[PDB]
Design a protein around this ligand. Structure first.
Ligand SMILES: CNC(=O)c1cc2[nH]c(-c3ccccc3)nc2cc1NC(=O)c1nc(C)ccc1C
Ligand SMILES: [Mg+2]
Ligand SMILES: [Zn+2]
Length: 313
């Protein structure tokens, strides 16, 4: 009850900023996450005996892959933390509880391969869930860990509060399927421009929570340049690995994943910032003005990639 977590001063200050990096010390990430729940939700939201055992179970069910790892789960969780703290009064008690757990769980038991690669491999998980394949799996694995003796961090919720929080988490994890992002942003775009966006419309909060999740999951591109650049290596190490496995199934992989076309990479970063990253945080900024620092950071980094091409690094 009376046991706060307390970070070193530099972390105590930087963590509140959007562009904070959670650092190379694995053992401090659970403290960081727990810190963010207490400040975001209340000291009282979850039993600490139980939260700690849910954290360490989730930590274990992320694999040792180059990008889609435990450091991603906490990084994404942190960016939602920043969004929630800068939009204090826009979100229910339940949404703040469910959304931080969603982000920590959003990529559970990821193997470093796209939904596309699962379908062309004929992995079983592709037979079991035709669309948003990894994403239905991640939610699945989330409800597993919630149901281990001693891991139900929600058991003090009422029947119907519990039913709402599991429904928030599911939509949130499904919304991380980038394939559904493009359609979701467009609807939110029209709704904000035609003035029809209504945050008490539940189907509308859903859409907005969808965009938030996309923005947190892409937040790699919203860090200072040297974090963005070094993360790109991790992202591309999975992509080229999947390309290698595409080639083993006798398919030429798309250039994004072909290690032979590293040269074309800076240009592929341009298309990505232009087609996905910039729009995402633009639309987010319009709906949630306090999230403008993400948009600014993303633009600074688009500008760093333009330099990489122009020979200037
Ligand atoms: C949907 N589209 C994308 O995700 C994309 C497409 C690309 N095409 C090329 C490319 C390369 C060499 C030659 C031609 C083309 N690089 C690409 C990188 C991409 N994404 C990320 O970097 C990326 N993806 C996530 C989910 C989080 C962060 C990042 C930073
Ligand atoms: Mg994912
Ligand atoms: Zn992710």
């Amino acid at each position: 009850g009376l046991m706060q977590f307390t970070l070193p001063v530099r972390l105590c200050k930087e963590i509140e900023l959007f562009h904070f990096d959670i650092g190379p010390f694995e053992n401090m990430w659970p403290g960081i996450f727990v810190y963010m729940v207490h400040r975001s939700c209340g000291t009282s939201c979850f039993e600490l005996e139980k939260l700690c055992r849910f954290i360490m179970s989730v930590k274990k069910n992320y694999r040792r892959v180059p990008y889609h790892n435990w450091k991603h789960a906490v990084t994404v969780a942190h960016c939602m933390y920043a969004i929630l703290q800068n939009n204090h009064t826009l979100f229910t008690d339940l949404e703040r509880k469910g959304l931080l757990i969603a982000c920590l769980c959003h990529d559970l038991d990821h193997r470093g391969f796209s939904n596309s690669y699962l379908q062309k491999f004929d992995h079983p998980l592709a037979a079991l869930y035709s669309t948003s394949t990894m994403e239905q799996h991640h939610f699945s694995q989330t409800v597993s860990i919630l149901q281990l003796e001693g891991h139900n961090i929600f058991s003090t919720l009422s029947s119907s509060e519990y039913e709402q929080v599991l429904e928030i988490i599911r939509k949130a994890i499904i919304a991380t399927d980038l394939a559904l992002y493009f359609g979701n942003r467009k609807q939110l775009e029209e709704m904000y421009q035609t003035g029809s966006l209504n945050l008490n419309n539940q189907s509308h909060r859903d859409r907005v929570i969808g965009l938030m999740m996309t923005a947190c999951d892409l937040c790699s591109v919203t860090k200072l340049w040297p974090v963005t650049k070094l993360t790109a290596n991790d992202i591309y190490a999975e992509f080229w690995a999947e390309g290698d496995e595409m080639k083993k199934l006798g398919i030429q992989p798309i250039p994004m994943m072909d290690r032979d076309k590293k040269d074309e990479v800076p240009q592929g970063q341009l298309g990505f910032y232009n087609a996905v990253a910039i729009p995402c945080y633009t639309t987010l900024t319009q709906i949630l003005p306090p999230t403008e620092p993400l948009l600014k950071a993303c633009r600074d980094n688009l500008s760093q990639w333009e330099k990489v091409i122009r020979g200037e690094e």
